From TrEMBL, chain A:
This is EF-hand domain-containing protein. It comes from the Eukaryota. GO terms for molecular function: metal ion binding. Keywords: Calcium, Metal-binding, Repeat. It comes from Trypanosoma brucei brucei (strain 927/4 GUTat10.1). The keyword Metal-binding applies. The chain holds residues 1 to 338 of 422 of the full protein.
UniProtKB/TrEMBL annotation, chain B:
It comes from Trypanosoma brucei brucei (strain 927/4 GUTat10.1). The lineage of its organism: Eukaryota, Discoba, Euglenozoa, Kinetoplastea, Metakinetoplastina. This is Tubulin beta chain. Keywords: Cytoplasm, Cytoskeleton, GTP-binding, Magnesium, Metal-binding, Microtubule, Nucleotide-binding. It comes from the Eukaryota. Belongs to the tubulin family. The keyword Transmembrane does not apply.
From TrEMBL, chains C, D:
SUPFAM superfamilies: Tubulin C-terminal domain-like, Tubulin nucleotide-binding domain-like. It catalyses: GTP + H2O = GDP + phosphate + H(+). It comes from Trypanosoma brucei brucei (strain 927/4 GUTat10.1). InterPro entries: Alpha_tubulin (IPR002452), Tub_FtsZ_C (IPR008280), Tubulin (IPR000217), Tubulin/FtsZ-like_C (IPR037103), Tubulin/FtsZ_2-layer-sand-dom (IPR018316), Tubulin/FtsZ_GTPase_sf (IPR036525), Tubulin_C (IPR023123), Tubulin_CS (IPR017975). The lineage of its organism: Eukaryota, Discoba, Euglenozoa, Kinetoplastea, Metakinetoplastina. Tubulin is the major constituent of microtubules, a cylinder consisting of laterally associated linear protofilaments composed of alpha- and beta-tubulin heterodimers. Microtubules grow by the addition of GTP-tubulin dimers to the microtubule end, where a stabilizing cap forms. Below the cap, tubulin dimers are in GDP-bound state, owing to GTPase activity of alpha-tubulin. This is Tubulin alpha chain.
Length: 331, 430, 442, 442
């Protein structure tokens, strides 16, 4: 730790007038941890293992000197870029834990260093578990492969997981099919702050959490990196929604295009508007209304609202196509 | 099923202090003696090593004996020393003088009755008593003489229980005392008659463990005694925790000893790795088994590669599959088939315990019955024959009162032990 | 109607946990012993009675004892999840183990425990009105299972007499091994078991490990998997008592059809649709496919190859959606095969059973859900190979009197080794004579 | 699916530093062996396995050993930034250098260190399940690279046998030179490499200096630039194992396609879009331009002119956005050219590979970012001119025994010089005979 302060004499040692070798702590004058006749600063003997100690400290001041800058090795110049990033994080202990480390209290063998083991807390929670208690609990209480390190692979896997979660959940089911993806898209749009239709990692996380999907920050980092095509870590809402709809089969496309071509010929100048669709639809023929579980007026009202357009808006083929890909997601 | 511990002499008291630190840590006992653990699984077998004091406290079932109180004052001053019961410390007023005859005959018979009284008071308190465990050095004075005296008396008084010993034996390279061969020879003669199971440790082997495997720059006796405390506390783990295949000291003896004189065993403990390397290699059953059979990791100077295994036992701690254990033991037996005695169809017993030591995912302790134990005794007998022909220091022992005939009997008995191991080494089906 | 289960030692108690888990989940008893009251049930039902009895308050309690000499495993059962299901008297535990010594269990220590066990079994047998046998689970490799199992079977055989005793023993695997002294304990167990058992189902661990590696996709199996497979087998065998079916099979019919001579009661086992959930949706599982499966040695739960011997009798139990005509077509196809051979004195080699209840699926389990299953128990001379190898290992050790001082010191005569070894030699000759085709007749 | 890297001496370790920098940055492993949380989410992948193995805690550690007789370069690795990436046992260092003496490395000093190296490689190779070759980096001009590289390759070749060994070797350039004794060491090295290597790639520093002056605009290059170019070449050759592609090329296919006779295994290497950022934005870089580029001698990384010989085989690796039809059209256009000639016994002269992963960009690097690249290794008789010049320099020095007393003092017979010189003379005659324009029918 900085400045030592755990290699120094303790008050109990001073009061008891303790000597050196019973505990072999080199702090008294004239005694020092000599490896090969020299200090650990010199590369002789067992310096590598002594430098691997949990309580090791090197006397390097944080404020640097001039000759360190002047005297550099070619290897240091080659590998300095990674060193600057690698020096950001390091484990730290308080003083009581350092006292425990120096006194080497709880160890299976003399060289066992449990404080340097990153899996210690899960070991502690995992301790004192018996085979039967794990294997004989209460019986009531108890994926397409994707290959490659490419970010596109990660994005595809995450998209598939999200789609499966939405199918099993099915929030916001309406009287007319096609409201799940609409709710997800609206939730994403609501958390945009700028107005240009792009999102970053944190807003993507908040939006997908509001939409009902359980995620984490690394998931959103991977997704935004995978779906990025212009190098700015911005996520386009249109692109992600198009990927959430998925690949479309041929029969559904054929029916959609046939219905659109039929509707085109019944209008003037081949321009179709939304009130045409509202007037011409035959809502009382669905299986959900003839069986007797959804009223016809409610179904028509649900259909009219899902377009998110005024009654005089021009409905192109793109809007019709997108609307009925959204609806096919539930059938 | 309760064990009673006896700690004798300087080495025994020092090893005991580290052992009782390890046991108190594993069961979450504070150095004040208060239970502070975090699972009920710790409490249901606390009786095995601890006695119950009234409010919070637990007290450890151990007898401390020494001829000069210097060690007792050192152990009472240690970090866990307060836990020990005051009435369990028995001491005299003058040292053993590194002399077997003094320790056995003059101050031994004077003190031994008060020790037997304490051991009986401790023994009769158990609801069911398991074997005794003894720690002592063979090279010393009070450890060898009074320890073997006490062992003989307890074997007279409790012949149906188990007798287990951990014993320190003189290194081949540097002596700490000039008269080591006499004390060692007399003690091995007493042990081979009296003991049920005996473990032997060379300090040189612990130094080689530390330097080659752990790469310690400046090891101390605390490290050696920590390794020893680790194996001793490991052998009993299946006695005191649940597991898929429970085991017991008597079950170990039944599987390890083919004939009643062949009860001297080698020890090892597997997860050992240097502070720099531990981040680089995960624990797994192949790694533990390969280190476990490497002679570098065995705690005696004789190496298995010059002998053959009659029998071995491995106790595994942790949650792991049984198939991997069984197939590893089969693969080691099949690939190295010349090193296993052929008239026994399967030499390895396995046992599995769910709860590893804290901060390790898995561990195994290994007990081995190998004919290479004959090499240590032969070397000690050589040094004895060089000293005895010239009566090099014999007047001390004769002045205490010993007959020279004891030395010739003890030499003959050790030579017969070496011969019996050598004959089974070179035995054949015919 | 009723059956009493006796569980001995470590393997028997751990297998008991899986068995009672299955019987609870199949009948629907909760871990606290109370069935879900629901709204109502239209007609009154009784199938549980084979394994459970109800109190006047409607709690269920099971007809079993757990016997051990060491406390740890039974105390583990006592502290587990099923604490309230078992009656506390049923869980019997001693102070100290038999330390892999048959002699300690039989002579010294089990003699103290047997009278408590016999008093509990008597109290169970008094609370029955159509008891039709004992089922026993134990391992012969350990000390208490062999010694106390033999002593208790002897006492049961004197007190109860003619009542049947069916054992599901776990014998030592042919190259996987766990303890050094296994041959002595298995020989001495088998000597007592020869006189005092009606049908011995023999199981090995190496076969169930192979089965879980090959068919299921488990690289690192553990005993809970093996015990769940054994539990499935036991549920299949006892289903004939408990549910409606086309062709029921009472436990006395197994002994009548499967056992030709009173010593020839060692049998082999095999279970067909061991399959994982991912494999299960790519394949149909028709009657003829699972019937073809049960005769391959890759399906067996014991380590022996039946192509090196001759079958004497087979009993085939089908449960689930099966029609008798498909069973008949399958058996006729098996009969056509040239690598399956029957001794010429057994022309009508097969017994069939057909039950409507499909196998239950356990929440943590590894088997898939399937509409039909078949289970086989069969008597074959290939079981001689299992003994000859144990006896050879015994001869190897006994030539040097290996470890013998433990057995003689704890109270057993040296003579006891030679009698048992000669009895197993006679068992080898029984399998030689029974397997002989014909003599020199005119 | 796996490869093990062995780095020897100064050039091989310094080139290794650039290689492992690149492989880390390409996969995304941090300098401390970890991998960030977003690379390991959503998909589960194995491509690292060719070069890294993971511990059970998820740390990555690389499959390499570093061998040197002097401490300084390995101590630079031990104290640098990548300290935590490498396992400390893998970094092996001796006490003192081989002092430009082949004899000191091979006979006296390497004999002490070689058994540790073999033990580390064995411990690595046992923890593998699809090892598919050894990659070796060394220079033949220095003492330890020649002597210890030969000794280690001999031992590896006896112990591992048939497994392939591919070497990247820096030979002495035809007029830039750094030490006097280079001809002796290069001849003696080449004698060992003939028997114990499957393909040998030849490099000259003078060519990479020319390439860095001509294509890039760097007047004053240093070893880090050359080592980064070499690292790019190695990444191009090993990319076929690690990423998806249209036409994969396994490391055994290189050896099958490139080597016509067992001695004729020395290949030339070149790389196409070495280009600066200012030129890169002035030009399109279609497939046909880079295919035409790889055949110009200004693109080569070895100082030889291929116009003085005939090609026997070429292997062209395309990585990035390329479609096979343009590769076919390009190869047909190359085949049309009159200054490119193939031996008449090799009619089907080309092997192609196409991989989708584009080349990675290193933060301090000098290459531009480009959508596609091609790398070529080719076998040609022109290589015989390099050996003839080495032999002339050897003959000049050896006629007067100019330095031989050092070699004789460190343990070598004078005879070994003449043996090696006669073997390399036979290699020259092999390249004369194999290259024969035509044989007569009579
Ligand atoms: N299949 C299976 N085998 C088991 C199980 N438990 C133990 N075994 C095997 O049975 C043998 C050990 O027998 P044990 O039941 O432990 O012996 P024991 O009855 O406890 O006898 P003692 O040790 O004297 O108490 C070994 O071969 C084990 O592999 C189990 O749950 N399932
Ligand atoms: N491309 C490149 N060439 C190098 C590098 N280091 C040395 N060389 C060249 O390789 C030759 C020297 O070989 P060395 O590697 O120094 O010899 P060595 O392996 O250290 O052998 P010893 O001197 O005995 O230790 C000279 O031609 C150098 O120009 C390097 O880092 N990159
Ligand atoms: N391993 C170990 N050996 C010890 C320790 N203390 C003393 N010894 C050794 O034991 C021998 C001395 O025996 P000692 O205990 O003094 O005999 P005593 O005088 O009868 O108590 C010497 O070989 C010492 O090296 C210890 O703490 N650990
Ligand atoms: Mg038991
Ligand atoms: Mg050098």
């Amino acid at each position: 730790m900085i400045g030592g302060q755990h290699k120094k004499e303790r008050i109990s040692e001073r009061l008891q007038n303790c000597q050196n070798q019973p505990k072999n702590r080199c702090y008294l004058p004239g005694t020092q941890l000599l490896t090969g006749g020299y200090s650990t600063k010199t590369l002789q003997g067992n310096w590598s293992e002594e430098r691997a100690d949990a309580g090791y400290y090197d006397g390097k001041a944080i404020v640097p000197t001039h000759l360190s800058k002047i005297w550099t090795t070619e290897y240091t110049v080659m590998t300095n870029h990674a060193m600057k990033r690698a020096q950001e994080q390091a484990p730290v202990f308080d003083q009581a834990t350092l006292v425990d480390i120096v006194d080497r209290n709880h160890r299976a063998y003399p060289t066992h260093q449990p404080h340097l083991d990153p899996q210690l807390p899960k070991l502690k929670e995992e301790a004192f578990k018996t085979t039967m208690r794990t294997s004989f609990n209460h019986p009531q209480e108890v994926v397409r492969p994707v290959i490659g390190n490419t970010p596109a692979a990660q994005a595809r896997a995450i998209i598939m997981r999200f789609r499966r979660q939405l199918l099993i959940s099915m929030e916001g089911q309406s009287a007319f099919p096609g409201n799940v993806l609409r709710q997800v898209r609206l939730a994403l749009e609501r958390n945009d702050v700028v107005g240009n239709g792009v999102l970053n990692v944190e807003e993507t996380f908040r939006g997908f959490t509001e939409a009902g999907v359980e995620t984490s920050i690394p998931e959103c980092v991977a997704l935004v990196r995978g779906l990025d095509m212009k190098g700015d870590n911005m996520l386009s809402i249109r692109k992600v929604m198009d990927e959430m709809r998925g690949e479309e089969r041929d029969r559904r496309y054929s029916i959609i295009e046939g219905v659109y071509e039929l509707l085109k010929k019944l209008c003037s100048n081949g321009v179709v508007r939304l009130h045409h669709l509202v007037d011409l639809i035959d809502v009382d023929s669905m299986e959900s209304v003839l069986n007797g579980t959804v009223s016809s007026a409610d179904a028509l009202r649900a259909f009219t609202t899902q377009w998110d357009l005024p009654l005089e808006a021009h409905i192109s083929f793109e809007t019709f196509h997108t609307f009925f890909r959204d609806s096919s997601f539930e059938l | 099923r309760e064990i009673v511990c006896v700690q004798a002499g300087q080495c025994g008291n020092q090893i005991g202090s580290k052992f009782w630190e390890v046991i108190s840590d594993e069961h979450g006992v504070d150095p004040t003696g208060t239970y502070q653990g975090d699972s009920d699984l710790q409490l249901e077998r606390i009786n095995v090593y601890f006695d119950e004091a009234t409010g919070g406290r637990y007290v450890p079932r151990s007898v401390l004996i020494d001829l000069e109180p210097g060690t007792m004052d050192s152990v009472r001053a240690g970090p866990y020393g307060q836990i020990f019961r005051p009435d369990n410390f028995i001491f005299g007023q003058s040292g053993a003088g590194n002399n077997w005859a003094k320790g056995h005959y003059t101050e031994g018979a004077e003190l031994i009755d008060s020790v037997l009284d304490v051991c009986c008071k401790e023994a009769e308190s158990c609801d069911c008593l398991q074997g005794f465990q003894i720690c002592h050095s063979l090279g010393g004075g009070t450890g060898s003489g009074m320890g073997t005296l006490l062992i003989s008396k307890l074997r007279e008084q409790y012949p149906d229980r188990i007798m287990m010993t951990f014993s320190i034996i003189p290194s081949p390279k540097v002596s700490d005392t000039v008269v080591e061969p006499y004390n060692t020879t007399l003690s091995v003669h007493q042990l081979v008659e009296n003991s049920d199971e005996s473990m032997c440790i060379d300090n040189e082997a612990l130094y080689d463990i530390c330097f080659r495997t752990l790469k310690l720059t400046t090891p101390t006796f605390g490290d050696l005694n920590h390794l020893v405390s680790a194996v001793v506390s490991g052998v009993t783990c299946c006695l005191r925790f649940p597991g898929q295949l429970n085991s017991d000291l008597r079950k170990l003896a039944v599987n390890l000893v083919p004939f009643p004189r062949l009860h001297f065993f080698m020890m090892g403990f597997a997860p050992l790795t240097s502070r720099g390397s531990q981040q680089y290699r995960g624990l797994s059953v192949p790694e533990l088994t390969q280190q476990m059979f490497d002679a570098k990791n065995m705690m005696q100077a004789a190496d298995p590669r010059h002998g053959r295994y009659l029998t071995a036992s491995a106790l595994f701690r942790g949650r792991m599959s049984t198939k991997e254990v069984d197939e590893q033991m089969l693969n080691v037996q099949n690939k190295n088939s010349s090193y296993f005695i052929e008239w026994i169809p399967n030499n390895i017993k396995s046992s599995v315990c769910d709860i590893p030591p804290k901060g390790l995912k898995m561990a195994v302790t290994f007990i081995g019955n190998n004919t290479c134990i004959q090499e240590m005794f032969r070397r000690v007998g050589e040094q004895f024959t060089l000293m005895f022909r010239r009566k090099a220091f014999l007047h001390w022992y004769t002045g205490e009162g010993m007959d020279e005939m004891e030395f010739t009997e003890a030499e003959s008995n050790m030579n017969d032990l070496v011969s019996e191991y050598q004959q089974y080494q070179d035995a054949t089906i015919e | 109607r009723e059956a009493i289960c006796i569980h001995i030692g470590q393997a028997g108690c751990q297998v008991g946990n899986a068995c009672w888990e299955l019987f609870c989940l199949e009948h629907g008893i909760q871990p606290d012993g109370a069935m879900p009251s629901d709204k109502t049930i239209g007609v009154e039902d009784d199938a549980f009675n084979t394994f459970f009895s109800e109190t006047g308050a409607g709690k269920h309690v099971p007809r079993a004892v757990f016997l051990d000499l060491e406390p740890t495993v039974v105390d583990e059962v006592r502290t587990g999840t099923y604490r309230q299901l078992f009656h506390p008297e049923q869980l019997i535990s001693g102070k100290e183990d038999a330390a892999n010594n048959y002699a300690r269990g039989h002579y010294t220590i089990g003699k103290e425990i047997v009278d408590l066990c016999l008093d509990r079994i008597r109290k169970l047998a008094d609370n029955c009105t159509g008891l039709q046998g004992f089922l026993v689970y134990h391992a012969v490799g350990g000390g208490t299972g062999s010694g106390l199992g033999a002593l208790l079977l002897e006492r049961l055989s004197v007190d109860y007499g003619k009542k049947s005793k069916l054992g599901y023993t776990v014998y030592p695997s042919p190259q996987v091994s766990t303890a050094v002294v296994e041959p002595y304990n298995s020989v001495l167990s088998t000597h007592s078991l020869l006189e005092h058992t009606d049908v011995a189902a023999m199981l090995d661990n190496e076969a169930i490990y192979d089965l879980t590696r090959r068919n299921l996709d488990i690289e690192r199996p553990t005993y809970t998997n093996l015990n769940r497979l054994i539990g499935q087998v036991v549920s299949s065998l006892t289903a004939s008592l408990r549910f409606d079916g086309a062709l029921n099979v009472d436990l006395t019919e197994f002994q009548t059809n499967l056992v030709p001579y009173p010593r020839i009661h060692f049998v082999l086992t095999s279970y067909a649709p061991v399959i994982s959930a991912e494999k299960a949706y790519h394949e149909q599982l028709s009657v003829s496919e699972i019937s073809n499966a049960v005769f391959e040695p890759a399906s067996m739960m014991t380590k022996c190859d039946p192509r090196h011997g001759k079958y004497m009798a087979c009993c085939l139990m089908y449960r689930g959606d099966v029609v008798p005509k498909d069973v008949n077509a399958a058996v006729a196809t098996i009969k056509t095969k040239r690598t399956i051979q029957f001794v010429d004195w057994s022309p009508t080699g097969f017994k069939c059973g057909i039950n409507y209840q499909p196998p239950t699926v356990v929440p943590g389990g590894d088997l898939a859900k399937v509409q039909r299953a078949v289970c086989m128990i069969a008597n074959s001379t290939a079981i001689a190979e299992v003994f000859a190898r144990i006896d050879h290992k015994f001869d190897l050790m006994y030539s040097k009197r290996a470890f013998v001082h433990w057995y003689v010191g704890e109270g057993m005569e040296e003579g006891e080794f030679s009698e048992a070894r000669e009895d197993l030699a006679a068992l080898e000759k029984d399998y030689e004579e029974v397997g002989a085709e014909s003599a020199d007749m005119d």
